[PDB]
Amino acid sequence: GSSVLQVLTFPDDRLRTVAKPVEQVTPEIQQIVDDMLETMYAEEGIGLAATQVDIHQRIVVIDISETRDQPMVLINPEIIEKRGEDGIEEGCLSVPGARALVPRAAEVTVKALDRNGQEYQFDADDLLAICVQHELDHLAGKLFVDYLSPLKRNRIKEKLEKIKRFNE
């Protein structure tokens, strides 16, 4: 009942769009959620933000499980508390092939709506907390390369442009 969507890649200006809150959790929103899950699973990857598939609403899906059967849906997520410092080497479906250390909060408390519009909240640490922060950055138009030096980011940009230089 769902489809894999095209993932935008840096330097696509649409990745800089700031997502709007979801107004109501309609069947249309649930279809977006389902398509985002399908898209996330089509690849090695543990989360996806709607911005990355050119849908500029505050929708995130996550599955950090090894078995890929523990999905989490975050509509209108808000980080309401941050604690501590952590940082791991991150990659991004919208910056394929690039990896870098990103300083993050170690722990976050997040409030969101689930796929059915039910409000909930959770405290996250370790990989879940890092993933949440990475995905919420996407909704703000922010990519992990924005934490890097201009030189490192620009070299990544040029390499990704070369890969798509014959598209369209």
Ligand SMILES: CCCCC[C@H](CC(=O)NO)C(=O)N[C@H](C(=O)N1CCC[C@H]1CO)C(C)C
């Ligand atoms: C780690 C912080 C959030 C990661 C989310 C991304 C997917 C993404 O771009 N979401 O916007 C991912 O799965 N990245 C993967 C990644 O960096 N992973 C997957 C598990 C943890 C770490 C180790 O490679 C790679 C395979 C692209």
Ligand code: NI
């Ligand atoms: Ni990403």
